[PDB]
Amino acid sequence: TRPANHRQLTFEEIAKSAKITVNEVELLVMKALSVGLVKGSIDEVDKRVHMTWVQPRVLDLQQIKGMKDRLEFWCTDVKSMEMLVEHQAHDILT
């Protein structure tokens, strides 16, 4: 739901919204270790539940449309900056 960083999440939304306590969040991921969709490297000096790779969703057709700000972003930005490299690496065409 938040795609961005702070993926080393504190347990606060975990202990709040997922109706769990502080002593069980480890079980909440160690059982999830037996699940294996997410394999976070959970901090234990700060109790921070870290986010690694996941099985994300099932369907967000509003983001099958609204994926343009990532897909076309990737397209014209890796392609445009591709042409910024090749526009810098221009007259070594030789």
Binding site: D77, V78, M81, E82, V85
Partner: protein, 145 residues
């Protein structure tokens, strides 16, 4: 590839000189070196073989040639640095014997024939190899954005 036209002893009435267009059998005449065939100048004169202007296939052999033989879809290489690790240990491990040549250039007045030039083979390896290391350093900020 090789090809021959059997001339015969019936046609020795005329001389065995077609010649009408020349420099095609002049450049077929340019090798004229096969041991028993040079010997078999009697009874044999070869034929000229060009290769056809095959761009109806040389085009597609070209496009599958280079569309195929450089990373295919070319999102494959874009291994990188342990090769350099091994290559940097190459590219230090030859450097002490590469630098024995300035000792071998210390002949003071003159005592040496041809310099025994080992200047190259270690310039350009570092050159194109570390062009590959620096654009290889680019590929993070090229692939990502």
């Amino acid at each position: 590839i090789d090809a021959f036209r059997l001339i015969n002893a019936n046609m020795m009435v005329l001389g065995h000189e077609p010649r009408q267009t020349t420099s095609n059998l002049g450049h077929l005449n340019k090798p004229s070196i096969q041991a028993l065939i040079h010997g078999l100048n009697r009874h044999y004169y070869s034929i000229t073989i060009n290769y056809r202007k095959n761009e109806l296939e040389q085009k597609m052999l070209l496009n599958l040639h280079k569309k195929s033989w450089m990373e295919g879809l070319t999102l494959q290489d874009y291994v990188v640095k342990e090769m350099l690790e091994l290559a940097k240990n190459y590219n230090k491990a030859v450097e002490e014997e590469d630098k024995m040549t300035p000792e071998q250039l210390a002949i003071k007045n003159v005592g040496k024939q041809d310099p025994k030039r080992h200047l190259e083979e270690h310039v350009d390896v570092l050159m194109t190899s570390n062009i590959v290391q620096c654009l290889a350093a680019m590929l993070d900020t090229v692939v990502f954005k």
